[PDB]
Amino acid sequence: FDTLLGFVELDHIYSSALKEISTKLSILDDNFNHIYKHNPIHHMERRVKEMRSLIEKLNRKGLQISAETAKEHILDIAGIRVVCNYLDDIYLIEEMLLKQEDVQLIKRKDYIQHPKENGYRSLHIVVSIPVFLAERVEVLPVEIQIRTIGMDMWASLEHKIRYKNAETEKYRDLLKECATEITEVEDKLQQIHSEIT
Amino acid sequence: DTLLGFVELDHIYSSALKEISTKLSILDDNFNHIYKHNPIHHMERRVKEMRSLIEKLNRKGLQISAETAKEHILDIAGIRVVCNYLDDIYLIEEMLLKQEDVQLIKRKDYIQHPKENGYRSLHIVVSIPVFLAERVEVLPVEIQIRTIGMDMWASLEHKIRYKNNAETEKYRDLLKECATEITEVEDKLQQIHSEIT
Amino acid sequence: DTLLGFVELDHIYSSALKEISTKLSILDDNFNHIYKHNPIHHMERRVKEMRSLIEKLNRKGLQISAETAKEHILDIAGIRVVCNYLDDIYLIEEMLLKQEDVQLIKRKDYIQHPKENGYRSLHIVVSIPVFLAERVEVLPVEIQIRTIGMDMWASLEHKIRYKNNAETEKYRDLLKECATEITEVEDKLQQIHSEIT
Amino acid sequence: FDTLLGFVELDHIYSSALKEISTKLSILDDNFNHIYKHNPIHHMERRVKEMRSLIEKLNRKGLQISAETAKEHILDIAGIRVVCNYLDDIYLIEEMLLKQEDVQLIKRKDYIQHPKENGYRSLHIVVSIPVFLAERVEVLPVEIQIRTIGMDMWASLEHKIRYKNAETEKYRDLLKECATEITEVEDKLQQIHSEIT
């Protein structure tokens, strides 16, 4: 059906958006290491929301179900997580990214500055990037989650408890202890690395 | 010190290659999504090694430094885009050059007018911005767009000149015949492919 | 349940493809280190999708399950090894089949004896052990070894049959001519390459 | 010089060795995730010792300097670090690897069972693997260091203090605190993950 075709196109163009941001981030990481001897980025992961998740979300909001609706109302269709070696790399990567001429900052939420009640810590920014296609240019939003390795280890276990669902409450306070415990050890590693660089 | 400049040159022109690769990969994928055909067969990136920069500077009587190479050699970074069919070459060019941040610097169409020795390729030098940690660099990249068959020829011819160049005269008439025979069969394959699409 | 078997089939035959890819990549690299020439131009792996397994099972009147497919279809996993020159094909075969953990199952040389329609490739089915988390599987893999030119032909011919197959008769005489013309030029390029090496 | 050639060959064949082990590990990781919903491996890194480090080491031992000497006396010429998500993945990966028919265990040292005085924790195993080359098979040793993410974060900062050299003593006891602090939080994450899987 015609409606179906748009969502296939949607997956493809947002994947291209991820390619654009990944290359910028890789170049930033690589040049920081060249000038300096430190790679701010440990690894990255990319994902594009599955069409079924998009329709569900659109259904939830009571909106007309098409790809054009999806673009307008869901801005983390494309997501990239940037896992950093040290806490200062997180803020630093953001500065290096957002000062680029063709990167527009759309939304920002700093769960490192303001941790979640559960203990989740990450830096969330939505940015827009031009994507040049065969016969047009698309300016597309991309959700970038920037975090430390420890933050990433915490968030993945928490996530694995939630979706797979009564266990979350059972582990809620102990996961908060780990989020606190992970924060503390990462600032000690941060301040040792700050001193020697 | 002089040597460091060339390491810097390699690094930043390699970053330029990543930027242009991503654009091309996105074009190829979008072209395929629209017309059910992948124009690009493969790509190969290369930065000219410092010894290839110096002899070219020497041949021009230029002072031997990375900044002189930067100013005077526009194929320091080169990417070969190998296409499945001859008409794909000109579609990749059109799709690339209409991007606002891609500027055409030089163009020479050895497909429209082959070299006497039989060589064919479309050469365009374009400029691309590279966003680094603490500065932006606009760098030229030489793009050689050719068919698979043109690439097989050029690789062998390139493998006649560099190793034991004296024989370049010995095979010149036979390599011209092969270039003609490759052209002939690629036009037949092009028109069979055009008819069914 | 039946569906799960096929997901398992895809996964383990994909692992077989990784094992054989690594062997071939190591052979290519070592051949290059000794003789200053890379025999392999590129490779493409593919697992036949479940719909391609079922119709083949149906065509044979076989019960529709992953275990029946496993027993009766030896090209579930296929890798195409595209070589730079015709003589490289037989050297890759010899180098691969002498490995103690590679067993030849089937061989058919369409280069020595092309198909009437013009197709050429060397087909060998080999078995490879795949070491999994909790068991070892010895799985067959169909390897199609061909030159770049053979690959261009087969891709177009393959693109005549599957989409709008009626025209397969229309282009049959013209595709035969192209296969002949590709053979002729690849033997000239082979002998120029052999002489300088 | 003739001696030089052997060391070039050495780098190449030990790199092939790394390719063989990487593929096995990737298949193990991927199959564990298929059967179970957990990827034991977070990431891997490969390195082959630089020729200058090999000569220095041979010089240190007062041995004749050739590639053949190097193979005999240096068994971590090829090294792969396997960074695991949880502490139990480390032991588990080892079991899955060493039960494979063509993997021979050569040496083992468990710094997780027995931490270093500084606080370093990792599992070190040297294994041998057949590498099939163009015209021979080589059974080559490979050093595999298996560790947790936290262990890897600890070890990299410690390493960055040592090579870059009076700072090591300054940070010695504080790095020991982090090694202890990292251990504690990783066993809490381990026991939460053990309970829900």
Author numbering:
A (entry chain B), D (entry chain B): 32 to 195, 197 to 229
B (entry chain A), C (entry chain A): 33 to 229
What do the authors of the reporting publication say about this deposited model?
Central to the stringent response are the two unusual nucleotides ppGpp and pppGpp (collectively (p)ppGpp or alarmones). In contrast, short RSH-type alarmone synthetases only contain a synthetase domain and lack the hydrolase domain as well as regulatory domains found within the CTD of long RSH proteins. Members of this ‘small alarmone synthetase’ (SAS) family fall into the RelQ (also: SAS1) and RelP (also: SAS2) subclasses and are found in a wide range of bacteria including Bacillus subtilis, Staphylococcus aureus, Enterococcus faecalis and Listeria monocytogenes. In summary, RelP always appears as a highly active alarmone synthetase, while RelQ can switch between a passive state with low and an active (i.e. pppGpp-stimulated) state with high (p)ppGpp synthetase activity.
To better understand RelP at the molecular level, we determined the crystal structures of RelP homologues from S. aureus (Sa) and B. subtilis (Bs) at 2.25 and 3.3 Å resolution, respectively. Both, SaRelP and BsRelP form highly symmetrical and oval-shaped homotetramers with a prominent cleft in their centers highly reminiscent of BsRelQ. Helix α1 at the N-terminus of each monomer stabilizes the medial sides of the homotetramer interface via hydrogen bonds and salt bridges (buried surface area of ~1200 Å2). Helices α5 and α6 at the C-terminus of each monomer establish the lateral sides of the homotetramer interface mainly due to polar contacts (buried surface area of ~1200 Å2). The (p)ppGpp synthetase monomers of SaRelP and BsRelP are highly identical and consist of a mixed β-sheet build by five β-strands (β1–β5) that is surrounded by alpha helices (α1–α6). Structural comparison of RelP and RelQ reveals the architecture of the homotetramer as well as each of the monomers is highly similar (r.m.s.d. of 1.292 over 138 Cα atoms for the RelP and RelQ monomers). However, RelP and RelQ differ in the orientation of helix α2, which appears to be shifted approximately 3 Å towards the active site center in RelQ when compared to RelP. Another interesting observation is that the loop connecting β3 and β4, which is disordered in the structure of BsRelQ, could be resolved in both structures of RelP. In stark contrast, the G-Loop of SaRelP was well-ordered and could be unambiguously modeled in its apo- and ATP-bound structures.
